[PDB]
Scaffold this active site. Sequence first.
Site, PDB file in Angstrom:
ATOM      1  N   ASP A 114      -6.312   8.246  -0.891  1.00  0.00           N
ATOM      2  CA  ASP A 114      -5.871   7.248   0.080  1.00  0.00           C
ATOM      3  C   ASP A 114      -4.684   7.766   0.890  1.00  0.00           C
ATOM      4  O   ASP A 114      -3.770   8.369   0.312  1.00  0.00           O
ATOM      5  CB  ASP A 114      -5.422   5.981  -0.624  1.00  0.00           C
ATOM      6  N   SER A 156     -11.621  10.694  -4.548  1.00  0.00           N
ATOM      7  CA  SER A 156     -11.188  10.410  -3.199  1.00  0.00           C
ATOM      8  C   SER A 156      -9.671  10.245  -3.198  1.00  0.00           C
ATOM      9  O   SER A 156      -9.048  10.197  -4.270  1.00  0.00           O
ATOM     10  CB  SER A 156     -11.897   9.193  -2.637  1.00  0.00           C
ATOM     11  N   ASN A 173      -9.027   5.289   2.534  1.00  0.00           N
ATOM     12  CA  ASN A 173      -9.752   6.054   1.521  1.00  0.00           C
ATOM     13  C   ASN A 173     -10.642   7.087   2.205  1.00  0.00           C
ATOM     14  O   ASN A 173     -11.295   6.767   3.202  1.00  0.00           O
ATOM     15  CB  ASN A 173     -10.743   5.179   0.760  1.00  0.00           C
ATOM     16  N   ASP A 185     -12.112   8.417  -8.696  1.00  0.00           N
ATOM     17  CA  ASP A 185     -13.383   8.953  -8.242  1.00  0.00           C
ATOM     18  C   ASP A 185     -13.214  10.286  -7.508  1.00  0.00           C
ATOM     19  O   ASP A 185     -14.211  10.854  -7.066  1.00  0.00           O
ATOM     20  CB  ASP A 185     -14.109   7.914  -7.394  1.00  0.00           C
ATOM     21  N   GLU A 240       0.834  -1.188   0.000  1.00  0.00           N
ATOM     22  CA  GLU A 240       0.000   0.000   0.000  1.00  0.00           C
ATOM     23  C   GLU A 240       0.875   1.245   0.000  1.00  0.00           C
ATOM     24  O   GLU A 240       0.571   2.203  -0.695  1.00  0.00           O
ATOM     25  CB  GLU A 240      -0.932   0.042   1.212  1.00  0.00           C
ATOM     26  N   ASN A 263      -7.521   8.691  -6.099  1.00  0.00           N
ATOM     27  CA  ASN A 263      -8.330   7.687  -6.785  1.00  0.00           C
ATOM     28  C   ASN A 263      -9.059   8.324  -7.967  1.00  0.00           C
ATOM     29  O   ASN A 263      -9.251   9.536  -7.999  1.00  0.00           O
ATOM     30  CB  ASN A 263      -9.322   6.985  -5.852  1.00  0.00           C
ATOM     31  N   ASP A 268     -15.822  -4.488   8.733  1.00  0.00           N
ATOM     32  CA  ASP A 268     -16.928  -3.925   7.964  1.00  0.00           C
ATOM     33  C   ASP A 268     -17.778  -4.980   7.246  1.00  0.00           C
ATOM     34  O   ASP A 268     -18.815  -4.661   6.659  1.00  0.00           O
ATOM     35  CB  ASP A 268     -16.385  -2.884   7.000  1.00  0.00           C
TER      36      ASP A 268
END
EC number: 3.2.1.17
Length: 129
Positions: free
Chosen positions: A52, A50, A59, A48, A35, A46, A101
């Site tokens: 990280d 967003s 995110n 979209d 990562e 990202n 989650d």
Amino acid sequence: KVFGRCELAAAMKRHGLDNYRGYSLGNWVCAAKFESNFNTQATNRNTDGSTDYGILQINSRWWCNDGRTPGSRNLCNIPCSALLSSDITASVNCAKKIVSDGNGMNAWVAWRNRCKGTDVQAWIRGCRL
Ligand SMILES: [Cl-]
Ligand SMILES: [Cl-]
Ligand SMILES: [Cl-]
Ligand SMILES: [Cl-]
Ligand SMILES: [Cl-]
Ligand code: NA
């Protein structure tokens, strides 16, 4: 801060990640490797819109507030900047919520693609823990 492999394993263990939701320490170190390359200050945008953040590339769409991700949530109740600290407390606390989650460590695409099903113990081999 760029952690050493064993140094990060130790810090993760102190913060209670070892075997958290059944994920051995090796899984967490492997995820961090791919990562962020163990760099607390890692950021990546990202598609979209967003972003990280940190050693586990958390995110902004769901987990932290960065003030520039339309329609996003802040389910860890923190500014995304807290995730860049040389202190990994915030990152670990937030990771616990993420991995709880429903999808486990599959939340991290890189873990699914690069760590899942592999010899993750290699990541902690020779570490004093
Ligand atoms: Cl390494
Ligand atoms: Cl392990
Ligand atoms: Cl936002
Ligand atoms: Cl905030
Ligand atoms: Cl990947
Ligand atoms: Na957010």
